Amino acid sequence: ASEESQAFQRQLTALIGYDVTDVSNVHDDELEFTRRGLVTPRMAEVASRDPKLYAMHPWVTSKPLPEYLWKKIANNCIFIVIHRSTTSQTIKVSPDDTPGAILQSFFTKMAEQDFVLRVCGRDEYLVGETPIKNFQWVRHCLKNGEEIHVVLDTPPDPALDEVRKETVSLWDCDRKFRVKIRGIDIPVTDLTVFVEANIQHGQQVLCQRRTSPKPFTEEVLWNVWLEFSIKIKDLPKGALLNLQIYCVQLLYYVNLLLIDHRFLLRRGEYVLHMWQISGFNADKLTSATNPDKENSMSISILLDNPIALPKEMPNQLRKQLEAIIATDPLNPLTAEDKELLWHFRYESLKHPKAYPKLFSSVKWGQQEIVAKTYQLLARREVWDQSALDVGLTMQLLDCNFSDENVRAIAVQKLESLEDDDVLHYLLQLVQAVKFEPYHDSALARFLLKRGLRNKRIGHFLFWFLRSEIAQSRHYQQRFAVILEAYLRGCGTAMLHDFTQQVQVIEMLQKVTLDIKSLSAEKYDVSSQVISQLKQKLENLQNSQLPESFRVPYDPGLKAGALAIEKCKVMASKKKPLWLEFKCADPTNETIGIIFKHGDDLRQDMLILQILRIMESIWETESLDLCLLPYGCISTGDKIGMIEIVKDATTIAKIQQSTVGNTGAFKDEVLNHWLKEKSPTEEKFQAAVERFVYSCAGYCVATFVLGIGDRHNDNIMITETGNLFHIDFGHIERVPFVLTPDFLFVMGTSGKKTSPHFQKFQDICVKAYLALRHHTNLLIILFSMMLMTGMPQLTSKEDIEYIRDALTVGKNEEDAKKYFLDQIEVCRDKGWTVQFNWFLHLV
Ligand SMILES: Cc1nc(NC(=O)NCCOCCC(C)(C)C)sc1C#Cc1ccncc1
């Protein structure tokens, strides 16, 4: 209503990248009702959260301090360098010392509580009643053997985060369901079309009726009643009326929810703008209609049937039911299996791992059965009590489940995750919103309240939602209605940082797309393209870009002015921008960021998230495989950013040092580069230990994912011997890369065993074992990222690579040999595929 409240909605639309106050693409108030419906949990969180802790966002974890990291604390007391101006005197504190206790041990050891421990060079705070061992920044320093540098700083003002003042039933109706297909209208040789109407409940198709084929014209009228066998009483909440135009080839689709957001049966006249098939995918389930009215095929339908929706086993069969529960998520159930799970549903409820299969075997098109399922769900004693299995929880949030009650018990288990884990699974929990039948949901409300509770979760939430909105027309309506709901609770300070970030990304994306236009595809980096970049960049800095911004992939870091003398264009075919920015904290080395158009960085983000999940799985088994999970955020269509890792070099560039652009690869090349880049033999004998652990980790990780066969120009290594892979936005043969240059560093010529190669295969095989223990988790993370992120998704063979790879249904002893067989494939191949990878240049 306020004249300035209208200017707030245009700031929101600039941050979101979509106008939520738009009704040109809706046939009901589903999104408007969701906007108002979210005010309640937004305000409950904004009110619930403590302001002094929300402002300083302490990054803690309640997981035990790992064994390898404990070895670094040999004195049961670690060093903390506290700095204030000139002062820079260290302190020895016990790992059980709260930052409050370490405050009394700094003031009493000097000659008041209004000072906090802030890390040097970042906006990261060691505050709150949590032991110093549980702070992430402390654990990060103990991993990379770095010294703890803090500052006696003034705490931020919690008032900076201020917020702006914000009839019959179905079960009585015994008639059959019907829908009149009036016609189809395309704006614009000699084929036929027919329409197919389906009653769907997630994946499962309850009923199906088609029209008679009629010639392919601009307007095709039918005016026909399609009668279905399903009674109106039997329609479940979340039932979708999928209308498809077939040429026998699917050309267009559009969904419409039979039961609306108010439990009412949908009736009336509807003119639906349809999506074209690109010439399985989460986008196929979307309730949103095609916004492009000018170029899309339309379908007009009619309904009127108000009507509202109301709210002891033998050993043999036990052995069959247990065998079924044991099988992996992708093992398909048969009618025999489904029937056995249902009849013995009370036995199945006693095992929580049998939840996805028990609910996958429910007759959803039968009111009577869904009513039994809801009574069955009330006996949730086992479920509530049970330990949180995130892998199992996520199965219940995928495409196979449209049930609000089924999906909600899963969100109830997610409320147990601490911030630390909510960050690991955030990308995936965000995509799972695509599978929710309705806009307002338990999951949406869950992501909102956690983002609003923690500024680190909030920052990442923003970038993930802003990402899908900027490259998904099927879901931008839903995700923007959730991003507005968040942005209206993060508080003024966040709303300012996001504006500066969005602004910088927008300008640099323009320059990335402009430099790509200038430098031709079949063209190297000339003097024209390099000087045009420095010219374009000077005009941005001189009055059109913020003097400061938080780094999207690492928010604790604030980047400042552009070091234009250090920026350049990369030699890749996609011509990425290598940019360097000066650090914005005085507390002169820059931040390196790569901007890139051309590759799908959602696939990059989805693999990088899985590497943090994998190294977490290992951390619990007291393993550390030094994976370098560099930052990378997708910002729109094929465009996005990548973190430049300090003093790291490509493996292919290391060999084309001894001898340049040629296929004669030496083994000693990498072994020399490591010693040449090491000051003392102590630092070189460390680089081989960082190489053995990091190398073994990337071998197992890429193998389980099916991205082990990579060109060595996409494999980098640091001067400190930390190997890492880059550019995952792509996907004879090889399982993973273990080329003879790497073996030389471990001590083996080939077909030999050295003491370090022995160390390598020991951790290598123990890491495979560790991941095999979390088979269902990896299967679901990959299975879900293919439903949403990877658009070339095969719901048959693509999804099942990880099944064969993860040694399903096999003993742990065979696995040790099988993994070592794949090690020996890389021994006999040597440089066979690496040579053919170099040959892919011409
Ligand atoms: C992840 C990553 N790190 C690198 N590090 C590096 O070049 N260091 C060289 C020296 O430090 C730079 C110096 C300073 C800026 C730190 C001050 S390049 C790279 C990549 C990539 C990529 C390309 C295409 N698609 C996806 C990913």
Side-chain angles (χ1 to χ4, degrees), residues 1-35 37-164 167-217 219-232 234-247 249-472 474-522 524-645 647-675 677-792 794-795 797-842:
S2 169
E3 332 308 324
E4 287 86 347
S5 274
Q6 290 146 8
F8 186 66
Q9 196 71 70
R10 94 184 55 114
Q11 168 165 45
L12 258 55
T13 300
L15 294 165
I16 296 169
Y18 182 91
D19 185 31
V20 275
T21 57
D22 213 273
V23 303
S24 84
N25 194 44
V26 293
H27 59 83
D28 70 357
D29 51 3
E30 228 252 298
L31 288 157
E32 268 308 315
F33 163 110
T34 304
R35 276 177 69 195
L38 290 164
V39 165
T40 281
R42 148 162 94 262
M43 286 174 127
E45 215 54 17
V46 162
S48 252
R49 66 159 184 251
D50 165 309
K52 60 113 190 175
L53 299 167
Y54 180 68
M56 302 190 283
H57 53 249
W59 193 17
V60 303
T61 169
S62 306
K63 301 170 178 54
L65 198 277
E67 270 99 328
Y68 45 91
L69 293 179
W70 242 119
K71 305 302 161 291
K72 276 90 172 182
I73 329 122
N75 205 316
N76 191 28
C77 273
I78 194 62
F79 300 156
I80 291 182
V81 185
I82 296 185
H83 308 233
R84 176 69 183 273
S85 316
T86 85
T87 309
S88 157
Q89 200 69 18
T90 335
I91 295 101
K92 197 155 195 166
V93 282
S94 167
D96 308 341
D97 277 326
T98 296
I102 82 165
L103 269 176
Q104 87 197 125
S105 299
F106 189 81
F107 300 138
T108 54
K109 216 173 180 182
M110 237 75 172
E112 237 115 61
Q113 72 110 355
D114 307 294
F115 284 138
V116 292
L117 289 318
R118 197 253 295 171
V119 317
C120 276
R122 312 169 117 267
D123 280 30
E124 199 53 79
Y125 295 78
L126 293 326
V127 306
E129 286 298 317
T130 320
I132 45 156
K133 59 168 192 155
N134 295 352
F135 283 87
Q136 290 283 22
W137 189 243
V138 175
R139 300 195 186 210
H140 175 58
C141 300
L142 301 172
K143 167 162 182 156
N144 306 77
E146 42 145 315
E147 325 101 337
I148 304 277
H149 291 259
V150 94
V151 356
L152 198 70
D153 198 17
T154 165
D157 185 84
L160 292 170
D161 297 297
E162 227 53 83
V163 291
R164 191 183 118 269
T167 309
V168 78
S169 82
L170 278 180
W171 310 347
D172 276 338
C173 254
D174 293 306
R175 310 270 246 254
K176 312 284 184 168
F177 174 79
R178 62 204 302 254
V179 66
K180 173 176 278 279
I181 310 300
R182 301 192 161 277
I184 63 168
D185 196 274
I186 176 85
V188 69
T189 311
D190 293 18
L191 321 89
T192 86
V193 292
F194 75 89
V195 327
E196 189 204 67
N198 302 282
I199 305 297
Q200 297 198 205
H201 183 255
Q203 301 306 303
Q204 216 167 34
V205 162
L206 318 201
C207 244
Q208 166 178 296
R209 296 310 207 245
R210 308 174 141 192
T211 72
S212 43
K214 266 174 147 88
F216 231 137
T217 156
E219 181 188 63
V220 188
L221 307 182
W222 267 274
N223 173 234
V224 97
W225 276 103
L226 294 192
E227 178 111 297
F228 291 80
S229 281
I230 321 168
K231 288 182 177 162
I232 306 273
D234 280 318
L235 300 173
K237 206 196 167 49
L240 236 35
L241 176 72
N242 172 232
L243 300 145
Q244 288 189 327
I245 285 168
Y246 278 108
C247 166
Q249 192 206 135
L250 180 67
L251 305 200
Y252 289 93
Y253 68 98
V254 82
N255 299 311
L256 174 95
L257 270 168
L258 297 179
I259 293 168
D260 73 16
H261 55 291
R262 287 189 181 88
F263 288 80
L264 297 166
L265 181 72
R266 176 146 291 159
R267 52 103 84 222
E269 278 264 9
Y270 290 86
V271 161
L272 301 176
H273 267 53
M274 310 172 99
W275 305 99
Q276 186 174 353
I277 286 303
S278 184
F280 277 70
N281 210 325
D283 290 359
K284 294 207 64 67
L285 304 168
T286 202
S287 53
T289 56
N290 195 342
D292 171 24
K293 303 239 213 173
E294 184 205 18
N295 294 327
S296 51
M297 159 96 83
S298 173
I299 185 170
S300 183
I301 89 196
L302 173 90
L303 340 137
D304 217 311
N305 324 78
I307 308 159
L309 175 65
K311 274 154 285 190
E312 225 65 341
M313 200 193 199
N315 104 56
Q316 235 321 154
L317 298 183
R318 174 160 282 111
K319 279 203 296 229
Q320 186 160 170
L321 199 66
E322 286 174 5
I324 293 175
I325 304 169
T327 62
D328 69 81
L330 313 175
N331 188 107
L333 306 176
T334 68
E336 307 89 288
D337 300 349
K338 288 196 181 191
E339 255 164 50
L340 187 82
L341 295 153
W342 183 258
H343 190 258
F344 300 118
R345 57 189 171 270
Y346 291 95
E347 201 53 53
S348 314
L349 199 76
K350 245 169 290 181
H351 308 239
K353 262 165 272 167
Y355 275 47
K357 294 164 174 287
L358 175 51
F359 299 106
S360 286
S361 73
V362 159
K363 290 297 178 69
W364 297 99
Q366 257 134 87
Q367 201 307 287
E368 34 281 6
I369 275 192
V370 180
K372 291 186 162 52
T373 304
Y374 291 175
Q375 303 152 17
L376 176 69
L377 271 159
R379 245 126 145 165
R380 248 199 274 104
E381 252 124 306
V382 184
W383 189 258
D384 304 344
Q385 238 73 48
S386 83
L388 168 62
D389 191 314
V390 20
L392 184 79
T393 298
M394 304 248 307
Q395 313 179 30
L396 298 167
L397 296 164
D398 75 7
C399 62
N400 300 101
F401 303 94
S402 326
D403 201 57
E404 276 33 86
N405 305 293
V406 162
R407 290 183 75 91
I409 69 167
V411 180
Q412 134 192 338
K413 236 72 173 77
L414 295 174
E415 300 286 1
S416 304
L417 287 170
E418 43 169 55
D419 304 322
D420 205 43
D421 307 318
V422 171
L423 272 166
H424 287 113
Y425 301 100
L426 185 55
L427 204 54
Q428 257 98 12
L429 290 166
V430 166
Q431 317 284 323
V433 161
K434 297 197 196 150
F435 309 126
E436 272 273 1
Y438 305 92
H439 302 332
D440 183 359
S441 62
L443 181 73
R445 291 176 171 247
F446 172 80
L447 298 173
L448 167 64
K449 122 219 330 168
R450 301 302 303 258
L452 285 180
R453 191 182 301 174
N454 191 283
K455 287 197 163 186
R456 189 168 182 86
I457 294 169
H459 173 95
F460 284 119
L461 177 59
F462 173 92
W463 283 103
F464 297 163
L465 297 180
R466 217 215 182 256
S467 163
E468 286 307 338
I469 289 160
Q471 67 193 290
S472 173
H474 304 71
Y475 289 97
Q476 73 202 339
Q477 254 139 38
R478 179 184 283 171
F479 287 129
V481 139
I482 303 165
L483 190 57
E484 182 203 43
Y486 164 70
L487 286 172
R488 292 201 179 271
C490 54
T492 295
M494 293 230 69
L495 279 160
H496 178 60
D497 293 331
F498 288 136
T499 356
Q500 301 182 339
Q501 281 162 36
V502 171
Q503 198 160 309
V504 174
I505 310 315
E506 280 185 341
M507 312 174 319
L508 306 177
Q509 286 185 146
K510 191 233 56 168
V511 177
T512 314
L513 246 295
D514 282 14
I515 281 306
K516 280 193 70 183
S517 276
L518 288 176
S519 206
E521 195 67 60
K522 184 124 80 171
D524 252 344
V525 276
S526 63
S527 37
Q528 247 239 353
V529 318
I530 197 90
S531 305
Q532 232 127 223
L533 177 68
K534 50 169 168 285
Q535 177 155 140
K536 250 116 124 36
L537 294 176
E538 89 203 3
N539 305 332
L540 292 186
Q541 177 59 261
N542 299 344
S543 312
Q544 195 204 182
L545 62 80
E547 299 271 306
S548 230
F549 64 104
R550 298 204 166 278
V551 166
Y553 60 79
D554 193 353
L557 259 178
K558 230 185 183 283
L562 251 176
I564 287 171
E565 335 75 49
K566 314 298 255 53
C567 308
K568 62 245 205 170
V569 172
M570 327 207 320
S572 170
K573 263 181 163 206
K574 273 90 196 178
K575 306 276 165 51
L577 299 189
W578 173 290
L579 310 179
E580 292 188 39
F581 301 82
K582 309 146 189 183
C583 193
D585 198 12
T587 322
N588 13 6
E589 205 92 352
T590 44
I591 314 295
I593 312 169
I594 293 160
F595 257 86
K596 191 223 294 183
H597 181 256
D599 307 340
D600 193 358
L601 293 183
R602 282 194 303 202
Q603 306 163 5
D604 256 89
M605 287 194 101
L606 285 163
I607 281 125
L608 290 177
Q609 202 84 326
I610 298 187
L611 297 176
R612 281 176 272 260
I613 294 162
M614 285 190 190
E615 60 183 358
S616 80
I617 287 169
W618 296 321
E619 174 209 24
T620 69
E621 269 91 316
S622 300
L623 311 156
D624 180 20
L625 308 182
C626 328
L627 302 191
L628 211 129
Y630 68 93
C632 160
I633 63 119
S634 176
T635 50
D637 191 21
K638 308 282 230 311
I639 190 71
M641 78 194 72
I642 303 111
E643 171 170 3
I644 294 175
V645 177
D647 276 34
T649 307
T650 299
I651 288 300
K653 303 292 181 167
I654 280 165
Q655 86 214 345
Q656 309 205 335
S657 272
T658 66
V659 47
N661 184 357
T662 201
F665 315 127
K666 203 179 61 186
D667 319 326
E668 199 244 326
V669 291
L670 206 266
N671 198 62
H672 176 267
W673 182 86
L674 288 180
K675 182 52 222 164
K677 295 288 191 162
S678 267
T680 67
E681 236 279 352
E682 299 115 57
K683 297 165 212 160
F684 174 62
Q685 242 168 121
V688 80
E689 230 250 340
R690 196 65 162 177
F691 183 69
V692 155
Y693 279 81
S694 70
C695 185
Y698 273 104
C699 307
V700 190
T702 47
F703 187 28
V704 181
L705 292 165
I707 327 137
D709 206 343
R710 303 227 63 201
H711 182 211
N712 69 340
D713 178 70
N714 302 314
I715 287 123
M716 305 195 67
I717 202 177
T718 66
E719 293 182 1
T720 69
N722 203 332
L723 204 278
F724 70 95
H725 284 222
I726 57 141
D727 209 10
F728 310 98
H730 185 260
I731 330 307
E732 260 293 351
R733 216 72 51 168
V734 102
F736 46 93
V737 293
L738 198 51
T739 51
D741 56 357
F742 298 156
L743 279 318
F744 215 76
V745 182
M746 304 183 249
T748 292
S749 56
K751 321 305 199 316
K752 193 205 158 181
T753 301
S754 68
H756 245 130
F757 171 66
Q758 246 165 76
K759 179 123 180 248
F760 164 76
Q761 54 192 181
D762 170 44
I763 56 195
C764 206
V765 83
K766 287 295 173 305
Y768 183 46
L769 262 32
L771 302 175
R772 280 185 77 258
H773 285 123
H774 297 65
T775 284
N776 290 27
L777 176 62
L778 308 169
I779 278 169
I780 236 67
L781 296 169
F782 165 100
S783 183
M784 277 197 55
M785 91 174 178
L786 260 52
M787 295 162 182
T788 49
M790 179 184 285
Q792 43 116 106
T794 312
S795 293
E797 61 116 48
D798 236 44
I799 51 140
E800 299 199 14
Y801 174 100
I802 191 175
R803 297 183 59 174
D804 314 285
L806 227 19
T807 296
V808 289
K810 322 292 205 306
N811 47 281
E812 239 203 10
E813 286 66 32
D814 141 69
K816 178 201 86 273
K817 183 64 234 182
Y818 176 63
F819 187 60
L820 262 144
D821 274 329
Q822 314 293 270
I823 290 286
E824 258 63 28
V825 172
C826 316
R827 306 271 258 132
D828 178 76
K829 294 299 271 184
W831 299 102
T832 305
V833 87
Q834 206 54 252
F835 198 72
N836 198 2
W837 278 128
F838 177 91
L839 288 177
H840 257 257
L841 283 176
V842 190

